[PDB]
Structures are given as structure tokens and as C-alpha cells.
Write a protein that binds this ligand. Sequence first.
Ligand SMILES: *[C@@H]1O[C@H](CO)[C@@H](O[C@@H]2O[C@H](CO)[C@@H](O[C@@H]3O[C@H](CO)[C@@H](O)[C@H](O[C@H]4O[C@H](CO)[C@@H](O)[C@H](O)[C@@H]4O)[C@@H]3O)[C@H](O)[C@H]2NC(C)=O)[C@H](O)[C@H]1NC(C)=O
Ligand SMILES: *[C@@H]1O[C@H](CO)[C@@H](O[C@@H]2O[C@H](CO)[C@@H](O)[C@H](O)[C@H]2NC(C)=O)[C@H](O)[C@H]1NC(C)=O
Ligand SMILES: *[C@@H]1O[C@H](CO)[C@@H](O[C@@H]2O[C@H](CO)[C@@H](O)[C@H](O)[C@H]2NC(C)=O)[C@H](O)[C@H]1NC(C)=O
Ligand SMILES: *[C@@H]1O[C@H](CO)[C@@H](O)[C@H](O)[C@H]1NC(C)=O
Ligand SMILES: *[C@@H]1O[C@H](CO)[C@@H](O)[C@H](O)[C@H]1NC(C)=O
Ligand SMILES: *[C@@H]1O[C@H](CO)[C@@H](O)[C@H](O)[C@H]1NC(C)=O
Ligand SMILES: CN1C[C@@H](O)[C@@H](O)[C@H]1CO
Ligand SMILES: CN1C[C@@H](O)[C@@H](O)[C@H]1CO
Lengths: 390, 393
Amino acid sequence: LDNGLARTPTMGWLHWERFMCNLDCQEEPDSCISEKLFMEMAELMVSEGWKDAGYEYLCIDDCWMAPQRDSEGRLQADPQRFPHGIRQLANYVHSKGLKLGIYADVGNKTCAGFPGSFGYYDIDAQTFADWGVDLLKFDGCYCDSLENLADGYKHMSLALNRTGRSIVYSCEWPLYMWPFQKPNYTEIRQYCNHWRNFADIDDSWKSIKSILDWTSFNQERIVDVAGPGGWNDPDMLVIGNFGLSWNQQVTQMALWAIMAAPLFMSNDLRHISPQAKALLQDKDVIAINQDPLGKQGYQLRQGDNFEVWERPLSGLAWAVAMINRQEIGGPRSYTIAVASLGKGVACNPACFITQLLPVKRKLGFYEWTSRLRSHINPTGTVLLQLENTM
Amino acid sequence: LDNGLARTPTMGWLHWERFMCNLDCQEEPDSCISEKLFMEMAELMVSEGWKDAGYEYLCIDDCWMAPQRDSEGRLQADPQRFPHGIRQLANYVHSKGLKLGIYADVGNKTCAGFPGSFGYYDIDAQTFADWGVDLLKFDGCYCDSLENLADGYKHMSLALNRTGRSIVYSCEWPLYMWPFQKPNYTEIRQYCNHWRNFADIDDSWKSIKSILDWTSFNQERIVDVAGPGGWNDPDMLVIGNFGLSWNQQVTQMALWAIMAAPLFMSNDLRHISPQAKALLQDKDVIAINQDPLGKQGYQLRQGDNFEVWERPLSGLAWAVAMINRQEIGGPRSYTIAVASLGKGVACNPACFITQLLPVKRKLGFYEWTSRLRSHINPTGTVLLQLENTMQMS
Ligand SMILES: *[C@@H]1O[C@H](CO)[C@@H](O[C@@H]2O[C@H](CO)[C@@H](O[C@@H]3O[C@H](CO)[C@@H](O)[C@H](O[C@H]4O[C@H](CO)[C@@H](O)[C@H](O)[C@@H]4O)[C@@H]3O)[C@H](O)[C@H]2NC(C)=O)[C@H](O)[C@H]1NC(C)=O
Ligand SMILES: *[C@@H]1O[C@H](CO)[C@@H](O[C@@H]2O[C@H](CO)[C@@H](O)[C@H](O)[C@H]2NC(C)=O)[C@H](O)[C@H]1NC(C)=O
Ligand SMILES: *[C@@H]1O[C@H](CO)[C@@H](O[C@@H]2O[C@H](CO)[C@@H](O)[C@H](O)[C@H]2NC(C)=O)[C@H](O)[C@H]1NC(C)=O
Ligand SMILES: *[C@@H]1O[C@H](CO)[C@@H](O)[C@H](O)[C@H]1NC(C)=O
Ligand SMILES: *[C@@H]1O[C@H](CO)[C@@H](O)[C@H](O)[C@H]1NC(C)=O
Ligand SMILES: *[C@@H]1O[C@H](CO)[C@@H](O)[C@H](O)[C@H]1NC(C)=O
Ligand SMILES: CN1C[C@@H](O)[C@@H](O)[C@H]1CO
Ligand SMILES: CN1C[C@@H](O)[C@@H](O)[C@H]1CO
């Protein structure tokens, strides 16, 4: 989408995976989907260094709406859980130097059952723009036809453009198309800043594995379309929650960097370990994810329960990730000729290699004839940056 | 097995899950199956407080043998990887105050392909006894018939008895029967100190879940068989490795305590986080696992992606574990009437409840009519101890 936005993958925070559709503010005031929760997240995004690291978009997902539209047919936030309204919340978020994302649905209802936007694309777009919304995630539930799906996504894209406000447009179009026909990614990229390809992530290593396996299986179809203004979205970062071991969190961070993925944290910023915070705020890994060249990486090799992925970077640099998919035993040795990396260009005549994950370590100079040997933890990933000696 | 051993579930360390059958001591010296590895593991078991916590048996698994037997027809340790032999390794292990476990197979070969014990049961038992072995894990690979499997397990049990040396006998008999017929657990318990029921564990939450689900599915068949001298073995503790989140590690520790399981760590004691160490050395949870009553716990309730397990303890106490099996979202609230716990005995007339996991916190006095409210993390477990009491506050 050539709206001048998302020139690097969007970074921010999205409530869905961690907080879902919790409406019980009587019994659970501190985790229900409310204006107070988003105020607290915004405060911590500023105070705990998230904004400094690049996490900029504070995004509302499903279950913010009142059960019905107002008298004039516009969407409204729930009166009790969002007493001051979305425009006021956006004002507060902007006063912190942050941007506000919101959620809507192309069909007749949101996935959780709140008002859909079908029939209201222009009024809903203008409402969001009036509110000061900076991002829209557009879900695909309750849509009866592929025609309605495509027409709705394109229509909302154009309506957002017509409002004249810069609004990042996040689509689930491909995901809801795939069961029936193959998405045309050129068209999607024409209309969307990023797009969900695969099933919702949850707080599990199984989820990570299946997202990675789907991405690598379909990479011939999705890798080359990505670039500044339009990214593949493998869904939220779940680092800092409950289901991932340290090495699985490392794997998610490293490979979301390799895949030039939007980095939407979905966790509790009020209760997050120092270790998870340091991983999510890792300057070198984020810099890889945010590389201005914007070329999505890919799986280079697969075998012996090992995976090698790589991503071309600005200025003749490359990122290389090595995953150990064997879920038994200990750190396993993997070796590869450096001439086999970066299409044979990365280390010709030589490269300096710096390991970034799980720990940062200068590995030294590697000649074009050299072999890179590493030990990779079960379900963990080793992430490396290669700098050609020029 | 009435040999006076394993009156509580055996505690120790077993190399299999973390180190497997790594024979490449040239290119992978730090993880190959060698005598140096076991010497160092013993040193850290003493120095790092594992022995104090109760972990006593340093156990060799598969891939310690030379490719074939000696001239005298006995097993021998691998000349390259165990140059000083099992007798000297056992002497060293005993000098640290520990006991040595070893591995063998009922069939013609070990699962990794080394000499089996069929045809040599008495010589192998006497070999181990001469070496100073204190525990034997007896695998079931390369056995063609239930005839041979059963006869071999019974035979090796009696052969070990014949030596006059106290040797804990760990069997995989039930697990290897399943392809043919359901185990007779009274008979197995007659011959074994503990027995593997289910497929090998690996370093994954999927593995923990499948072991737990199998155990709770089959609990009417196996729970009552367990007791002092004979335990169900749900396989090794994998806390301290790579595949489990903190909450999943808590779940494994809590429920291995609930199940009166043998506690065989399989990790690298040289590279283990302080948090995993504190969990594995948790005095109160180990005390639950080691409760002298020796009655195995069970799944009390299941539903809405929640599980409630409980274990009766000596002196009218109970352990209660609450698992959140929903793998999305945040901590979920669960409430239960205390009268539904401990068969209605735990909190009659009252109980004092102490949470032990994920953190230790006294919750207070709960009267028989009261309700317990808790919040449980996704894939985590809340472990509680209920102490029956006649006091009210
Ligand atoms: C070879 O097999 C035989 C049996 O097939 C086995 O003999 C058994 O040994 C056990 C353990 O020593 C005996 O049980 C003990 O019996 C005495 C006398 O009746 C009791 O005082 C003992 O009580 C103590 O230990 C108990 C735990 O076992 C505690 O519950 C108790 O509080 C006491 O501390 C204990 O019950 C058993 O009587 C014999 N059985 C027979 C038939 O002789 C022998 O040990 C085996 N040998 C080897 C090397 O495995
Ligand atoms: C509406 O769409 C137009 C055209 O697709 C966008 O115009 C582009 O804006 C970028 C940066 O602002 C320029 O580099 C391109 O050259 C522009 N293209 C054209 C054809 O003018 C415009 O940004 C969109 N407006 C909104 C509010 O989304
Ligand atoms: C996928 O969609 C794109 C855009 O809708 C199609 O590309 C257009 O093709 C027409 C020819 O019919 C050209 O006039 C346009 O210039 C193209 N646009 C772009 C941006 O390339 C493309 O044909 C579609 N692919 C398939 C297989 O249907
Ligand atoms: C919404 O519902 C109406 C009537 O039930 C139907 O005609 C229309 O196609 C629906 N829209 C979508 C996007 O499913
Ligand atoms: C071991 O191999 C011999 C030789 O073929 C065979 O006769 C015997 O039955 C085997 N034993 C077992 C337990 O499989
Ligand atoms: C199981 O084996 C034991 C030992 O022979 C015997 O006492 C018991 O009756 C057997 N049970 C069945 C069901 O055969
Ligand atoms: C099912 N949708 C897609 C998922 O990403 C959330 O946005 C949820 C909201 O209902
Ligand atoms: C497959 N066996 C059973 C498992 O517990 C190990 O002992 C392994 C040795 O080869």
C-alpha cells in the first residue's frame, strides 16, 4: 500500500492474544478490555523503554465496541469500559508520543459478535479518521462470499485513503481467502500495509512451529511480494507470556526479524520478566527486523531436524538464523560453508560474523573458504549477522 | 518388589533424555557417554546440593557397554569411553555418598544395539553385584514374545535377589506389553520396584501433556497398584533443559509429586538455571512426592480446559494440583468448594492451606463450608497442601 506508511514493519502492542475478549470488569477490573488497560499500557510503553526501542502503535483488538451503533449509525466504544470514548483515548495516546490502532470487521459482525462494517465502510473509515485513529486491523469473519471479502477490503482501503488521514491498514484478506482460492498477493499488497496469512497464534511452541512451517512451505509465493509498505504478518509476538521456553522465545524473536514481520507484542507490560523485556528490546535484532532495505528473508536449508534461514540486509550485510527442531537431547552441532550463505556473496572474499542470539558474541573473520560451526539448543535459534569485508 | 528398597519413590539422575547415545567423544566430548561425564555429574550432585535434596542414584542409561562380551562371557564397559571400568566408577560414586545405577536389556540387544542380557541373566546380575551396582534399569527391546519378555523380567528379578546385594529394579515390562496385551500390574509389582508405563518422554510440553493424559485416562488401572516398594514410572524429569516454559516445568514437578513418581532428573547439572535448581530442590514438593503413606494421587476433575488432581498424604493431609490447559490468554480463575477436596476429609472441620507452587504462600484457614479461589497460568499448575485441623483461625 503506497500510503507512505509502514516503510519498515510496524512495531507496537496488540491486546488480543494476552487479554482476548475479557468483558468481566466486575470480577477482573485489571485485565478486562477497558480504557484503563490501554492507558496503563501506554504509560509503560513510555516509561519502560518500549517506545524508545521502536514499539509505537498501541492497538485495540476486538471487543471494544458497544453492542450496537449509535443513533446516526456510527460505531461507538462500550460506554462502561470506554467511558471517555476512542477519540479521547487517542488524544491521550498521542500526548505520550504514541499511535492508536483499532479493530473492525469486513463482514456483518466481528469475530466476537459485535457490529461489523459491511454496509458502513465509508462512515466507519471517516469515524476512525475523526477519532484520530492511526491504524486499523480489519478482520474477515461473517463474510458470505469471496466477492464480498475482496470488495470490502478494497473498499475500506480506498475509504481510508479518502479520509486524508494517514492510517496503517492491516488486513486478514489472504487468511480468509486461502481455504477457497489462492490469494493474488500483488493485489493484496496494492491495498494493504500488511496481511495475515495463517491461523491465529496462541501461547505455544506448536503455534510457532506451524507458523514457520507454513511460511517456509509457501515462501515462493509470499517472500518476494513483501517490501516497504507491504509485509507478511505471521501474527503477534507472544514473548513474555507463559507457553514458550526461553529458547522458543528466542526462536520467535529471531525469525520474526528474519521474516521482516510486523512486531506486535501481545503480553502484559505490567508483569514481564527482565529477560523477556531485554529480548523484545534487543537493539541489534530489531535493527535487523527494521532494515530499511525491507527484503524478507527465507528458508535456505532444511534437514536433520535443522533449519537455516537467511535475510539480505542493507549494505552487503546478511542475517542468518539456524533452528534446532529436534526436541530431545542437548545443544546440537551444525556446520555450513559460509560460501553457501547469502547467495555466495555475503562472505566473498570474507565476512565478519557476529552472533546476536541467544547471546551476543563476536565470532571473528570468516574467509570465503571457511565453515561456520555452531551449537544450537533444542527448539532454540542461533542468529548471526554477516558483514562483508567490502 | 519386596526387597526392602524404594519405600518412597527413588530419586536420582539418569543420562538418557539429555545425553542419549552420543558416542562421538572426539567431536562432542562434553556430551558423549563417558566415565568422565558421570564423575563430574557425581561431583556436582554433591557440591550443588542435589544429594542433600534427596537425589541419590546416579544412573547410567544405554550405551555404556563394549560392542560385545569378554572371553569369560561377561559384559564389559566400553574400553575407550570407560577405561577404568564400572567397579572403579562405582567406588568413586560411593565415596561421594551416592549410589550407582546401570542399564541392561531383557532381549538379545539393548535398544541402541549393544549386548542384551537374554541367556546371561544370572551372570549379568552377578556382574552388576560384583561391580557394586545399586540400581538396574532393564529395557525391553529386541524381545520377540510375551513369553520371553515376562520370563526375562521375572528371571532377572530373581537373579538380582540371588546375589544378596540390595539393587533397585526398574522395569519397562508394562510399556513393552501394550503391543500384545494389557499388563497384569499385581504380577509386575511382585517383581519390580517401579515400571515404565508410557512412551519415552522428550523435552516438550506435548510430551508432558500426553503422559498426564495417558495416566489420567488409565488411572483406574494403575493408581491403586502403586505403593511402598512398587511405583508407576511416568519417565524422567526434564526440568532444566530447553523445551519447557517455567510454568510447564512447574506443572511437571507438581504432578510428578502428585503421582508418587520416581524423580529421575535428566539434565546437565553443570549448566542449569538457578530457578530450575530451586524448583527441582523444592523441599516441600519433594516432601509431597516422598510422603511415607505412599499412596499415588489421581485426577479428581476435568473440564473447561481445567484439571484438578489430588493426592492423599499421611496424617489427614492432601496435595491438590490445578492445571490450566488453555494455551492462550492469561491467568484463569478457578474456584472449588473445599468439601469437594480430599474426599471431604481434608477440611473437616477445617484445613490450613499452603500454596507451594508457583510460589509458596500461606493462604490461611478454610472451614469445611468455605470455597477456595485460585488463578492458574496457561500451561501452569497451582500446587496446594491442605492440613486437616480442628482450629478455625
Ligand atoms: C530376596 O527376596 C526376599 C523375598 O522374596 C526378600 O526378603 C524380604 O525382605 C524384606 C526386607 O528386608 C522383608 O521385609 C521385612 O521383614 C521384617 C521381618 O518381618 C520386618 O521387620 C521389616 O520391617 C521393616 O522394613 C519395612 C520396609 O520393608 C518397614 O515397613 C518396617 O517399618 C520396618 O522398618 C520388613 O517388613 C521380608 O520379610 C522378606 N521376605 C521374605 C519372604 O523373607 C529379600 O530381601 C530379597 N533379597 C534381595 C537381596 O533382594
Ligand atoms: C492515497 O493514495 C495515494 C496514491 O496511492 C497516496 O499517494 C502517494 O503518497 C506517497 C507518500 O505520501 C508518495 O510517495 C507517492 O508518490 C504517492 N502516490 C501518488 C500516486 O500520488 C497517498 O499517500 C494516499 N493518502 C492517504 C491519506 O492514504
Ligand atoms: C493480480 O492482481 C494484479 C493487480 O490487480 C494484476 O496486475 C495487473 O494486471 C493488468 C493486466 O490485466 C495490468 O494492466 C496492471 O498494470 C497490473 N497491475 C499490477 C500492479 O501489476 C495481476 O494480473 C493479477 N494476477 C493474476 C494472476 O490474476
Ligand atoms: C450481511 O447480511 C445480509 C442479509 O443477511 C446479506 O445479504 C449480506 O450478503 C451479508 N454480508 C456479508 C458480507 O456477509
Ligand atoms: C536371541 O537370538 C537367538 C538366535 O536367533 C534366538 O534363538 C532367541 O530366541 C533370541 N532371543 C530372544 C529373547 O529374542
Ligand atoms: C496376576 O498375576 C498374579 C501373580 O501370579 C496373580 O496372583 C493374579 O491373580 C494375576 N491376575 C490375573 C488377572 O491374572
Ligand atoms: C479471530 N480474530 C482474529 C484474531 O487475530 C483476533 O483479531 C480475533 C478477534 O476476534
Ligand atoms: C529406548 N530406551 C528406553 C529409554 O528410556 C532409554 O532407556 C532408551 C535406551 O535405548
